[PDB]
Each structure stands twice: as structure tokens, then as C-alpha cells.
């Protein structure tokens, strides 16, 4: 846990940024490239040696006023082009191809702002959207169709704030303002049938509009872990990591300790907690923590501009001490951090449109 900052950039509009996403879809050897969304613009950069960050691209939306919130990186199987998905307050989800330097798709089917975008780890053509409409949506980005809508009689009731796929792509966790954490399953026959039907829907084939899937009942819901806002959850193997306004990250698992995750009955009413990670100065919400692709370390932003880095090695809830890498320039706040495909560099975003970088030394 030893990084040496080598660069620090500042934008021009000085409006806060929210998203950083390394492109993990680059062949080994291709240059490291990442994206960053802000007030109403996006930015595309490449990382170079000696702490050099070279500007590559930037777009802007002038037709209205909106706040972009997140971003997502995938690829197109047909022609091998990179694809970037962005989402903002207007509820529109925009899919853009950097190769053609043009927006290629837009999806508008929500009722409020979008908060998180994630894709299926195996399927590159399933897009998951989390919104302020209390419901989660899942689209097929190829056939221009929806697949399933999560939410309803027994679902979230207030402001779903985040969701996360498991390491394999058949279980999803969701968390919102109503202090509730809910589990959705994708391995059911229902979901694969809907997916397989979604991969074949020609509008010029039948007079019937496509039939979506409504899921009104989660696999397991609870409000006992925290007692306040929960804004970020993460799959760590078969364990769950989550955060609240209680300045402490918690790792736990559903059911009892001996219980498995593929035998949990839907009417479960007991949760086994495992451990806690301590830090300070997280009194406001909307800060996300990130983990490396190899699942070997953890990074988390801070309001006073500091950092907190742990390791997912043999050591775990014991302590792992608390590595803090800080600099004297920006102490505004930090929204999201990101690692490259390997552990080379770590990027963080400060609240005043200032981007940072920390290279990995020994």
C-alpha cells in the first residue's frame, strides 16, 4: 500500500464530477484509456508514462440542463468497437461509440434520474439501470428492447441508490434510501426464457408489441444491517460489502453463518454479520468505494480529500491497519475511485472538477 501521485488536473467549468471508469476491455498491451463524466460534459483520456495524462475526446449536451452521474464501458461483438454508456438526471441513457464519434443509441423509459449503470460480466448486451423510480430495469442493447422490470408490490419503496452484479452474473444486490437491501436472482427459468425471447424480436415479424417481465418479489430483503441510508453495495465472492452514513463499512452474508447462498429460502429473517472497516468523515452520502478486478484490494474516497486503502489478502476484518494516501492540494470531497485492469494506477475525482492519479510503487 504505497502510491506516489504523479499528476493532478483541473477542468474549466469547475463543476463537480461523479464517474471514473477504466476500460477493462483492452487487449493486453493496448494503452490505458478512461472516461470521466461531470456536470453536463464527458471527457476521454489516455494514461502515459511519467504521470502524463493526454486529452483524447470530450462531448457536451446543449439542448437542456442535466447532471450526468455515471458511465459504463463495454464492447460490440460484431465490429469490436468500444462502447460507452452514460446516464443523467433527465432519465435518458445514451450509448456512444468513440470510433464513430457519434451517439448511436438513446433509451428513455424511466420516470426520474438514473443513478447507476452496470453490464452483465458474461453477456455484453445486457444493460442494468437503477433509478429514482424505485424500480430497476434491464435492457437488451442490441434488439432495442426491455427484458425485465424489478419493483412493485414487494420491492423497493424509496430511491434505489445502487446495485451490483455478482462475480459470475446470476445474482444482483440492490440498496436504496428505505434502509432495505434486496436480492434478485437471474438463474431462474423465467429470466433465461425472457432473455432468450429478447434475443429474437423482429418488429416486422408480428403485430404484437414485445412482452416484458415484471418481478414483484425479491429473493431476500432485510433492513437489519444498517439503520440509515445505504448508497453502495458490492459482491465480494459470496459475501456482501456495504456502506452507510455511519462512517463504517460492513461485510456480512445472508442467512446464518453455516447457511449457503443458493439454499436461502425467500422468507429468511436472519442475517449473519462478519466484520467492519473503520474510517472517518463520511457524514454526507453519495460516495462510492471500488475494488480491483482481481479482488485483492479496496479503495474508498473521503470528504476531506484523504484516501483509505485496504487489502483483500489473507488479512480481513482484523484491521489491515488503515493506509491513507493524502495530498495538500484538494480537500473538497471525493466521489468515485477506480483501478485499471491490473493494479498499475488509481484514479480519484475531487469535488471541484479536479482529477488525481496515484501510481503503484513498491
Amino acid at each position: 500500500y504505497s502510491f506516489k501521485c504523479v499528476n493532478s488536473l483541473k477542468e474549466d467549468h469547475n463543476q463537480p464530477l461523479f464517474g471514473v471508469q477504466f476500460n477493462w476491455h483492452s487487449k493486453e498491451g493496448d494503452p490505458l484509456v478512461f472516461a470521466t463524466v461531470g456536470s453536463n460534459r464527458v471527457t476521454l483520456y489516455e494514461c502515459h508514462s511519467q504521470g502524463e495524462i493526454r486529452l483524447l475526446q470530450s462531448y457536451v449536451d446543449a439542448d437542456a440542463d442535466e447532471n450526468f452521474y455515471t458511465c459504463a464501458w463495454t464492447y460490440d461483438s460484431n465490429t469490436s468497437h468500444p462502447l460507452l454508456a452514460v446516464a443523467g438526471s433527465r432519465g435518458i441513457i445514451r450509448i456512444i461509440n468513440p470510433i464513430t464519434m457519434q451517439c448511436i443509441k438513446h433509451y428513455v423509459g424511466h420516470g426520474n434520474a438514473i443513478n447507476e449503470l452496470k453490464f452483465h460480466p458474461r453477456d455484453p448486451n445486457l444493460l442494468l439501470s437503477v433509478s429514482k423510480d424505485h424500480a430497476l430495469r434491464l435492457w437488451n442493447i442490441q434488439t432495442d428492447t426491455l427484458v425485465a422490470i424489478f419493483g412493485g408490490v414487494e420491492g423497493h419503496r424509496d430511491e434505489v441508490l445502487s446495485a451490483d452484479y455478482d462475480l459470475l452474473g446470476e445474482k444482483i444486490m440492490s440498496c436504496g434510501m428505505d434502509h432495505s437491501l434486496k436480492l434478485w436472482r437471474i438463474n431462474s427459468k423465467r429470466m433465461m426464457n425472457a432473455i432468450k425471447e429478447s434475443y429474437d424480436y423482429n418488429p416486422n415479424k408480428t403485430n404484437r408489441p414485445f412482452i416484458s417481465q415484471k418481478i414483484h418479489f425479491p429473493d431476500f430483503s432485510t433492513r437489519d444491517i444498517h439503520r440509515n441510508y445505504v448508497d453502495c453495495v458490492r459482491w465480494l465472492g459470496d459475501l456482501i460489502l456495504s456502506k452507510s452514513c455511519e462512517n463504517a463499512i460492513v461485510c456480512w452474508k445472508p442467512g446464518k453463518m453455516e447457511d449457503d447462498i443458493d439454499k436461502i429460502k425467500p422468507s429468511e429473517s436472519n442475517v449473519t454479520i462478519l466484520g467492519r472497516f473503520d474510517y472517518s468523515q463520511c457524514d454526507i452520502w453519495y460516495m462510492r468505494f471500488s475494488m480491483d478486478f482481481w479482488q485483492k484490494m479496496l479503495a474508498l474516497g473521503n470528504q476531506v480529500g484523504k484516501l483509505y486503502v485496504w487489502d483483500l489478502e489473507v488479512e480481513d476484518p482484523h484491521k489491515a491497519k488503515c493506509t491513507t494516501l493524502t495530498h495538500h492540494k484538494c480537500g473538497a470531497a471525493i466521489r468515485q475511485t477506480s483501478f485499471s485492469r491490473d493494479s498499475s494506477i488509481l484514479i480519484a475525482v475531487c469535488d471541484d472538477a479536479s482529477i488525481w492519479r496515484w501510481d503503484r510503487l513498491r
Binding site: 457519434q102 448511436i104 443509441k105 422490470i149 415484471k214
Partner: protein, 438 residues
């Protein structure tokens, strides 16, 4: 001063290009409008005497009322080989995107350096096909300096007279080439536009001429015509008249409610980019009838701007009741995405039934099957119940035989009879049907 230019940045650029397009490619003739008729001067006093045969008469009377030319060069005063070609252009056909070109050569001799070479052209060009060719031209190409010279005019009348001429040359004080060619055979008003922004005035101007539309430079005559033109043809603005006694004053404000919506197919708006606005192809449309003008009244001729639609059918894009996705016109058919039995209700019924602990599955299964049946058909009147029962043994009986749950089914029938809803005969017949089917 930066603020108001930012404000009027959006309409002004559109209106400039619209000015140009309207002047070159008009929408409507401005002399045909009612409030600008003074622009036109002639009167319809000849649609009573005009006889179409007299057109032939007069036109015929008025309109009723080869050579192998040689050219000799004198030398090219440059500071080198040259040839002369006849280059002509053919009329555009529907097949041919643009006007095609054809060049025919002559192959003359070269010329001395800064001081023989001559040509004798002929009737190779055909004036008969005036329906094919547009115009011809003589060319002086090749470097080591190019020039061109048209020969015939619009109505194929050659203008190149007989004589000796000196023409220049250009690549791809200058090179020159002389030759010779011979055929061988009331007071001004003070209207002050006053632009407004941020609820306070920020600029004024002055058009001392009687008036011109500052965006399009159309010259109408009177003040009422000016207000009429400004208010309608520039709807993106909000003009406003007050009566400044010496002259006239006009104000400006950006319209917060301007119908800038798309006014075409209400399906093209939500189409993935690239597939939006295809144009080429037939598309189903939702019937819509309008009446914009039915019978107007030519009320007075002035004293209105300063002194002081019908509908039908469908004119909107409809949406699915559950996904907030657009609804196709084809899908706008008898399908109504609504029925008596939602799936979440059925699943919740099953889950709530299973929630009980002091009940046996031999009862829970019967309860679930009957509940699903009743929810599926929705019986209301008591007299329906008996028919319900037989329908039930007609419908779910197979499944019950798969479970052999008939004994509890008889018990449920007896309990139903306890509520005065079934008779002995109905119970007996249902039991017979179940036995026979089993």
C-alpha cells in the same frame, strides 16, 4: 452586452439563413397576402377578353419576324506544345446526376517560344439536337496554361465574331496567346426597436427608412403591415407595440411558449439515431383531421394590432400503460393491455395461502385451484355457482387426478353446500363427473 447577444444568439442565426432561403426559394408569394396587396399593382381586368387562339396569333406574328471556320495562330507569347479541343456540355437527364461533358480533339502543332500552327474546324457539332446538348466551348489546355471560351449563347446563337484576338492562359504578368478566327461561310419615421432582456432594457436601434424587417429586409409599406409581418413571420419573437406619439416604438422578448415541436409523423421522434426520419418508405399513420381556415371575415382594414382551430381524432403519441414506452399505431388495435387477472395477484394469493401453518396441503391445493379458477372467470351472482362447479370439474379435474385429491374435493363441496350455494344434485353430478374422468 454579452448577455443580450447570448439571448438573441439562437433566433438571429436561424432567421438570417431563413432570409436567404426565402429570398431564393420562396414559400408563398408575398403579393398574394391580404395585408400586403399594395405590393402588387396590376388588376384582373383581362380574364374576360383573353382568347387562347390569339396567343398563337400574336406569338407567330412576332416570332416569324454550314461554315467550316478557320483559325490561325500567331505565336504564344509566354513568360511548349498546345492543341485545340471542342468541349461541350449535355443537358441533364433524370438518370444523369449532373450535366455531362464531352471533349473532341484536333491535334495541332506546337508553337514557337516567345515570338504554321492553325486549325480549320467544321460542322462536327450538331445544332439539330438542341434537346440533347446545352452549349459548346473552345479550349486551350496543356502546360509546358489553360483557357476556355464559350461559342454559342443560351439560344444557341454564336457570339464569337470574326477577327484577331489575344487571350491569356492559366496553370492546371502572365502567358498570352494571340490568334485569329474567321467563319468560312411621408416624413421618415423614427421607429426605434427596443430590445429587452432580464426584464430591463439593454439596447436600442434606429431604422430611419420608413421600415424594413431587420431580419429579412422585406419592404412593406405601412405600420400596420409592418406589425403584421413582424408578429407572424417571426413567431419566435414577441413583438409589442406602444404608441410613442412622435413616431412608433417596438419591443422584443424571447418567447417561452413557442410551438417549436415537430409537426410530422409522431413516431419518428423516438427512433434510435440513424433510423430516425427515414422518409423513403410507406408508414401507417393515425387518422387526424383539422380545420385551420373554414370561413374568415375581412374585418375592417386596420386598427387592430395597436388599437387592440377545430380538431378531431388523435394528434399525440400514446404510451404503453406499464413501461412508458411509445405505442405503435399497429399495436393501437383492439389489444388493451388490461384484463381481470394480473399475475402478481395470483402469485401473492399462492404465497399468502402457503403462509398458514394449521392447514394441510390436501386442503391448500384445493384452495389454490379454486381461487385461481374464480379469479380467472370472476363469478358474481349466486346462481352462477353451480355452473362454476361443473366448469371446475371440467377444467382442473385432470390436475386433481394427478394428485388424487378427490376426497378433500368432496369435503369442499359439502362445506360449500353448508353456505346454501350448492344443491344435492349438483354435488352428486360433480362427484360422478370426477369419478368418470378419473
Amino acid at each position: 452586452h454579452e448577455l443580450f447577444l447570448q439571448a438573441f444568439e439562437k433566433p438571429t442565426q436561424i432567421y438570417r439563413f431563413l432570409r436567404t432561403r426565402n429570398l431564393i426559394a420562396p414559400i408563398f408569394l408575398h403579393r398574394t397576402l391580404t395585408y400586403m396587396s399594395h405590393r402588387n399593382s396590376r388588376t384582373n381586368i383581362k380574364r374576360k377578353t383573353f382568347k387562347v387562339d390569339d396567343m398563337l396569333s400574336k406569338v407567330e406574328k412576332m416570332k416569324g419576324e454550314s461554315a467550316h471556320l478557320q483559325l490561325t495562330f500567331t505565336g504564344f507569347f509566354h513568360k511548349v506544345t498546345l492543341e485545340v479541343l471542342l468541349v461541350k456540355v449535355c443537358h441533364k437527364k433524370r438518370k444523369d446526376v449532373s450535366c455531362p461533358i464531352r471533349q473532341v480533339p484536333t491535334g495541332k502543332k506546337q508553337v514557337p517560344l516567345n515570338p504554321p500552327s492553325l486549325a480549320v474546324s467544321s460542322n462536327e457539332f450538331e445544332p439539330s439536337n438542341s434537346h440533347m446538348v446545352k452549349s459548346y466551348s473552345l479550349l486551350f489546355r496543356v502546360t509546358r496554361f489553360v483557357a476556355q471560351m464559350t461559342v454559342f449563347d443560351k439560344n444557341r446563337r454564336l457570339q464569337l465574331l470574326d477577327g484577331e484576338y489575344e487571350v491569356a492562359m492559366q496553370e492546371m504578368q502572365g502567358p498570352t496567346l494571340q490568334f485569329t478566327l474567321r467563319w468560312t461561310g411621408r416624413q421618415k419615421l423614427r421607429i426605434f426597436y427596443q430590445f429587452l432582456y432580464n426584464n430591463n432594457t439593454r439596447q436600442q436601434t434606429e431604422a430611419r427608412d420608413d421600415l424594413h424587417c431587420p431580419w429579412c429586409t422585406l419592404n412593406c409599406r405601412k405600420l400596420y403591415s409592418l406589425l403584421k409581418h413582424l408578429k407572424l413571420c417571426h413567431s419566435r419573437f414577441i413583438f409589442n407595440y406602444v404608441y410613442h406619439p412622435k413616431g412608433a416604438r417596438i419591443d422584443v422578448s424571447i418567447n417561452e411558449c413557442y410551438d417549436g415541436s415537430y409537426a410530422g409523423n409522431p413516431q419518428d421522434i423516438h427512433r434510435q439515431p440513424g433510423f430516425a426520419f427515414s422518409r423513403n418508405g410507406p408508414v401507417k399513420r393515425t387518422p387526424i383531421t383539422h380545420i385551420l381556415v373554414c370561413r374568415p371575415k375581412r374585418t375592417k382594414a386596420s386598427m387592430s394590432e395597436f388599437l387592440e382551430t377545430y380538431s378531431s381524432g388523435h394528434n399525440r403519441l400514446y404510451f404503453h400503460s406499464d413501461t412508458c414506452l411509445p405505442l405503435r399505431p399497429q399495436e393501437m388495435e383492439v389489444d388493451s393491455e388490461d384484463e381481470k387477472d394480473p399475475e402478481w395477484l395470483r402469485e401473492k394469493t399462492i404465497t399468502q395461502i402457503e403462509e398458514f401453518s394449521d392447514v394441510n396441503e390436501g386442503e391448500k391445493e384445493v384452495m389454490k385451484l379454486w381461487n385461481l379458477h374464480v379469479m380467472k372467470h370472476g363469478f358474481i351472482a349466486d346462481n352462477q355457482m353451480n355452473h362454476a362447479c361443473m366448469l371446475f370439474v371440467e377444467n382442473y379435474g385432470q390436475k386433481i387426478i394427478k394428485k388424487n385429491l378427490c376426497r378433500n374435493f368432496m369435503l369442499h363441496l359439502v362445506s360449500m353446500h353448508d353456505f346454501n350455494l350448492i344443491s344435492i344434485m349438483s354435488i352428486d353430478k360433480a362427484v360422478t363427473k370426477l369419478r368418470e374422468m378419473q
